[PDB]
Design an enzyme around this catalytic site. Sequence first.
Site, short mmCIF file in Angstrom:
data_model
loop_
_atom_site.label_atom_id
_atom_site.label_comp_id
_atom_site.label_asym_id
_atom_site.label_seq_id
_atom_site.Cartn_x
_atom_site.Cartn_y
_atom_site.Cartn_z
CB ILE C 47 -0.96 -0.01 1.20
CG1 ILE C 47 -2.01 -1.12 1.05
CG2 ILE C 47 -1.63 1.37 1.39
CD1 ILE C 47 -2.91 -1.28 2.27
CB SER C 173 -7.60 -1.47 9.14
OG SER C 173 -8.20 -2.69 8.73
CE1 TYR C 188 -5.71 -4.70 11.02
CE2 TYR C 188 -3.35 -4.45 11.40
CZ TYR C 188 -4.46 -4.28 10.60
OH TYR C 188 -4.32 -3.67 9.37
CE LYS C 192 -3.95 -0.79 11.12
NZ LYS C 192 -3.11 0.29 10.51
CB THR C 222 -0.38 -9.18 -1.07
OG1 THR C 222 -0.72 -8.05 -0.24
CG2 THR C 222 1.13 -9.38 -1.17
N1 NAP Z 1 -5.62 -5.97 3.48
C1 NAP Z 1 -4.47 -5.15 3.84
O1 NAP Z 1 -3.37 -5.40 3.40
C2 NAP Z 1 -4.71 -3.99 4.75
C3 NAP Z 1 -5.99 -3.62 5.01
C4 NAP Z 1 -6.24 -2.56 5.83
C5 NAP Z 1 -5.17 -1.84 6.40
N2 NAP Z 1 -3.89 -2.24 6.15
C6 NAP Z 1 -2.79 -1.49 6.74
O2 NAP Z 1 -1.98 -0.84 5.52
C7 NAP Z 1 -0.78 -0.55 5.99
C8 NAP Z 1 0.29 -1.11 5.02
O3 NAP Z 1 0.22 -2.51 5.07
P1 NAP Z 1 0.39 -3.46 3.72
O4 NAP Z 1 -0.93 -4.02 3.36
O5 NAP Z 1 0.98 -2.71 2.58
O6 NAP Z 1 1.36 -4.70 4.21
P2 NAP Z 1 3.01 -4.78 3.96
O7 NAP Z 1 3.27 -4.95 2.45
O8 NAP Z 1 3.57 -5.91 4.83
O9 NAP Z 1 3.70 -3.33 4.41
C9 NAP Z 1 4.12 -3.25 5.74
C10 NAP Z 1 5.02 -2.01 5.87
O10 NAP Z 1 5.17 -1.71 7.14
C11 NAP Z 1 6.74 -1.65 7.44
N3 NAP Z 1 7.01 -2.11 8.76
C12 NAP Z 1 6.77 -3.27 9.39
N4 NAP Z 1 7.29 -3.20 10.64
C13 NAP Z 1 7.86 -1.98 10.77
C14 NAP Z 1 8.52 -1.40 11.84
N5 NAP Z 1 8.83 -1.86 13.14
N6 NAP Z 1 9.00 -0.15 11.73
C15 NAP Z 1 8.84 0.53 10.57
N7 NAP Z 1 8.18 -0.03 9.51
C16 NAP Z 1 7.70 -1.30 9.62
C17 NAP Z 1 7.23 -2.55 6.58
O11 NAP Z 1 8.65 -2.27 6.27
P3 NAP Z 1 9.70 -3.46 5.77
O12 NAP Z 1 9.00 -4.40 4.83
O13 NAP Z 1 10.85 -2.76 5.09
O14 NAP Z 1 10.19 -4.23 7.00
C18 NAP Z 1 6.43 -2.32 5.29
O15 NAP Z 1 6.92 -1.26 4.61
C19 NAP Z 1 -0.71 -1.16 7.40
O16 NAP Z 1 -0.96 -0.18 8.34
C20 NAP Z 1 -1.88 -2.19 7.38
O17 NAP Z 1 -2.24 -2.54 8.78
C21 NAP Z 1 -3.63 -3.29 5.33
#
Ligand code: NAP
Lengths: 276, 276, 276, 276
Positions: C47, C173, C188, C192, C222
């Site tokens: 995202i 979320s 979680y 959120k 993903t």
């Molecule tokens: N269905 C979904 O995917 C969904 C739905 C609703 C909300 N969200 C939220 O969208 C946001 C992005 O998630 P995503 O879906 O894109 O999953 P993602 O691809 O796993 O992205 C996770 C990001 O968070 C970083 N991260 C993890 N731990 C960290 C830490 N201690 N310190 C700093 N950065 C950290 C990661 O960095 P590295 O990879 O470099 O370690 C990565 O850039 C999150 O807040 C998630 O809860 C996701």
Amino acid sequence: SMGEIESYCNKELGPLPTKAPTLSKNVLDLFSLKGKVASVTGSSGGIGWAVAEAYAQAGADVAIWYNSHPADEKAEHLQKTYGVRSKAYKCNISDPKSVEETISQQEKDFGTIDVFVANAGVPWTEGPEINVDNYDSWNKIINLDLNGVYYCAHTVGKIFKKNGKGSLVITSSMSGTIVNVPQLQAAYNAAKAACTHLTKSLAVEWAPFARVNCVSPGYIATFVEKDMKAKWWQLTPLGREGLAQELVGAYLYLASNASTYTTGANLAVDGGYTCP
Amino acid sequence: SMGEIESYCNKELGPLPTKAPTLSKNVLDLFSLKGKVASVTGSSGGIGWAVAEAYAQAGADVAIWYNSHPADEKAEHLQKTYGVRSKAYKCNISDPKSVEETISQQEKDFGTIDVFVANAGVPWTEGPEINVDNYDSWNKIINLDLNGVYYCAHTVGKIFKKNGKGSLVITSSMSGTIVNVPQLQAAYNAAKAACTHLTKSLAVEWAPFARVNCVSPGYIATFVEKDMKAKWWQLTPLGREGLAQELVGAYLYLASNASTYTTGANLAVDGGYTCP
Amino acid sequence: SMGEIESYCNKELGPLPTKAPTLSKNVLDLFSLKGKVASVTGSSGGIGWAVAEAYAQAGADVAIWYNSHPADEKAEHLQKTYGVRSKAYKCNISDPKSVEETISQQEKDFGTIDVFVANAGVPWTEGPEINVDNYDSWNKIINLDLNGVYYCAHTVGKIFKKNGKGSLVITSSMSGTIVNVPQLQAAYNAAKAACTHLTKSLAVEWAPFARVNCVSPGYIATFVEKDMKAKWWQLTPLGREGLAQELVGAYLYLASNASTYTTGANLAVDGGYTCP
Amino acid sequence: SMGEIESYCNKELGPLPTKAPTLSKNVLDLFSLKGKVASVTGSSGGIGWAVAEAYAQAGADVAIWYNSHPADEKAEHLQKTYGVRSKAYKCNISDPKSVEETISQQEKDFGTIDVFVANAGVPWTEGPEINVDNYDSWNKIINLDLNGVYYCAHTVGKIFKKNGKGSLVITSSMSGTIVNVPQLQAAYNAAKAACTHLTKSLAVEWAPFARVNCVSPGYIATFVEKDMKAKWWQLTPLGREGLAQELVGAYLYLASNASTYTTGANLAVDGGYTCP
Ligand SMILES: NC(=O)c1ccc[n+]([C@@H]2O[C@H](COP(=O)([O-])OP(=O)(O)OC[C@H]3O[C@@H](n4cnc5c(N)ncnc54)[C@H](OP(=O)(O)O)[C@@H]3O)[C@@H](O)[C@H]2O)c1
Ligand SMILES: NC(=O)c1ccc[n+]([C@@H]2O[C@H](COP(=O)([O-])OP(=O)(O)OC[C@H]3O[C@@H](n4cnc5c(N)ncnc54)[C@H](OP(=O)(O)O)[C@@H]3O)[C@@H](O)[C@H]2O)c1
Ligand SMILES: NC(=O)c1ccc[n+]([C@@H]2O[C@H](COP(=O)([O-])OP(=O)(O)OC[C@H]3O[C@@H](n4cnc5c(N)ncnc54)[C@H](OP(=O)(O)O)[C@@H]3O)[C@@H](O)[C@H]2O)c1
Ligand SMILES: NC(=O)c1ccc[n+]([C@@H]2O[C@H](COP(=O)([O-])OP(=O)(O)OC[C@H]3O[C@@H](n4cnc5c(N)ncnc54)[C@H](OP(=O)(O)O)[C@@H]3O)[C@@H](O)[C@H]2O)c1
């Protein structure tokens, strides 16, 4: 205006703060309806009859309402089982003139009304709106489930204001908060959402003299397609439909002195259905 | 249905999962309305005209609606200035027959309708409902602000289903979420809450062929008393009323391919008013 | 105090009403981020990278954040494809001292920050809490998904206040609004929900100098159990998971001058999931 | 699983539908807590002591909790006055180890726990977060008002699961729903929003063996400045702060068999404050 704190909500409250009510020190006495008169619409039906009988158990005189199913034996059952005054009234609540006549007659027969439950309503049963090529079903739902609720509220509110006290409980529905599936019923959902927010609006307008709250039941058991209810059960955290008796505590809470700081609230009684 | 995951929301989606749309790789292209036809009710008024001109700037043909203030020069202004097709239509939207006739005429004139904005509406101006001795004003608000919105929705939805695509945007209000003070307006609040939940209900029902969303504006500068406005400013986190130009981004977001996974959503544009 | 209308929300707004911003008359120019600097955490992930690239397409300089997956090629891809300034930064956002060091370095490298997206987060993956017999997983979620979001907000807010302008977008979320099933993830969900209301709280506190909004995505595609997603699809009105590209319009809307009266809002981009 | 409808929320419910409880035919008997054991955290303070004494009046044994103000005489007062078993326990609830030890000791002393009220909490007192140069106060609020609530919930939930029954009531706040003004307190607001949604999340997870609900009080008279209170009164539809005795009805409703179909619900007791 000088020398008074005036409300931003409703200046009819007078100089702020308002006075707290006198309350019993025993929590159980707060739930009593002794000496109070209750009027429950749709009380020939399942939910309304359960609430009516609960209010009588709590000590209230109960005015019963019916439309197509005479409920005189119900009023006489309350009469004889609990020693309260009770009488049934015939009214099509979609007719605003008939609503005013019925409530005025009840005020004469009972002296006053302390608790009003705007509970009568009808469902939408016709599936997706897009295939319903006229508007009589939409208008039938709006006229009873929203306009009729308001006709009752507007009329009993004038009694509450005259006496300076009263509690209005509106029967909304979880359908005012979420969208039921798989049986689609947009008209009913819209009317119940209006009911829930009418509750909040009237709570503000009536605050000098009354409280206004609603209950939003989930699926309540009462010859409907078994696989459809199976999906309801699967989406309900408690795993079942509710009983009418599981609603009466909420209606007694809101009707009684147990809830004197509770107004404009929506009490969900839905087995958790609105959470997922 | 063996071998097929079918929806718990709407089996007209067909075998799940449904197919994702094809989208431009460039974010700015997602907001374009080129090659699309928009129909905006109440577009002689402030918000509706702002949204109509914004849609024309995005490349859409625009059908303009008026009731008592003819907007033919506005249509004309859009054709001249932006090179899109535009024409103004007279319609009392509380009349379901007129709504059907107007939208069918627009389908003929423009070929199709891709975007519909159900925006026409009137306020409640009469203060506390308890002092209003008849139901004419209540009924006027419900008939246009809820029933008229639904007449528009039901009519254009059949166009969307036929073509398998469409975006409906309903103009709700922060009044569907909170209770305005000090000017009390329960009927308007109830109608707008119904609009916000009709948005969600139709989003589920129309999911195989359309998206449905709503915008809930706060106070928009569009003639009222100075002390009352002052209290509005005091309760608004941004400290001011909004401009109609501050709404057009939300309406373009929902109307365009920028929002193809957004449906059933309420977008508050209210200066933070719903937060305190 | 005499001779001024003072806010009930935040007296730091000064004498009311506040001044409306100057805005372009063309709706498409409102979405531009030319001349602005954006900082997007978690922009090595799906995202966050989509939003970062969208912001660069809109003209913004973009500071990229990563933790365990270096994203220098991503920043250089933005550099070379869009001619913006871009650089990647390593930071464990659960460490408040490291957050402050990173944001201060970005302010030095870019001169300022105009748009901040607090997007980094981790999921709960361990099923029902009742069987998890210590608290490290709970604390890991709270520390990054709530505390870490606040560390970012508190730090960039001081920059926004110094410059008198800024837009903070928090990635919440749909889990902050509903309860996911059948994969249970209370920690979680709670973090959120706190994020969504932190958005509203900071919108009020920062109103003199910044806007604060959040986006609540639904399921975004993903190597997860196929029958579990089948149930997600069945409960999603659109019938599918979303694409990261279907989110970028919402993030650009909130980041840009398209949304200058929008603050404390939660934009649901969830395929309708929160409606049933 | 062939031949069995299993839940989409929580397959630990077993074959659906689940069995309805056996309930008294008399509404007043539903509110009784005779033969049940209640545990109320923060019951040296105003709200918690009011709820504890109410539960004792309903017939429950009551475990009283304190931290810095020993409440042994309160326990004593309950035993003496109502003939129930009661004892006071010292515990810093931000310490997860102490919470576990205290609840295990209560299970030994009373035999079981049927009702748990997670009520202990502290306010944010330091004004706008942007002027607070470290995170100690933020962390203090999160650790007690969110993490400490969860430590209590996780611990007592294992008792509820073992016995197959229980009712958890969390004290949230209207601050979990709205943003208090003019006293700005983002950290408290965020913690309470997390509490309200943890309530819903645990309601789903614990559905096979317990109900989980929360009460969101408004301003309760429980030492602050006069102009600030005056603005609270102006924004409250009832025109006054509430009394702790006006909360006990809601806590008894949720704790008792009056609410056996109520789970995941938030009961606002705020004088209407969340309505405008
Ligand atoms: N269905 C979904 O995917 C969904 C739905 C609703 C909300 N969200 C939220 O969208 C946001 C992005 O998630 P995503 O879906 O894109 O999953 P993602 O691809 O796993 O992205 C996770 C990001 O968070 C970083 N991260 C993890 N731990 C960290 C830490 N201690 N310190 C700093 N950065 C950290 C990661 O960095 P590295 O990879 O470099 O370690 C990565 O850039 C999150 O807040 C998630 O809860 C996701
Ligand atoms: N799962 C549920 O059942 C459920 C869930 C949520 C909310 N609700 C709402 O609960 C309330 C009571 O419904 P119920 O479940 O108890 O169904 P019900 O047994 O069919 O009761 C319907 C009641 O409404 C009366 N009624 C119908 N049309 C009327 C009219 N024009 N004028 C006056 N009264 C009229 C009926 O009177 P007659 O029978 O004498 O004609 C009857 O007393 C309704 O508002 C319903 O929408 C129900
Ligand atoms: N503070 C705000 O302004 C605010 C806030 C939230 C929501 N809204 C909503 O925005 C919409 C109205 O926009 P506005 O604020 O710009 O008010 P407006 O300037 O007075 O425009 C109202 C529009 O509605 C049309 N209209 C009135 N009655 C009609 C009828 N029977 N049939 C068809 N059209 C009719 C009017 O057409 P004619 O002038 O030609 O008669 C006009 O175009 C309404 O939905 C309103 O509730 C406004
Ligand atoms: N206007 C209101 O009062 C209002 C409104 C909404 C929600 N609430 C919530 O109601 C609850 C508090 O009740 P209250 O208003 O009556 O305030 P209160 O009189 O100050 O009582 C607070 C209780 O929390 C205990 N406490 C403080 N820190 C603790 C710690 N580390 N560990 C264990 N216990 C601790 C205190 O115990 P000791 O005194 O023995 O140290 C006391 O019993 C909180 O959840 C509060 O956020 C209050």
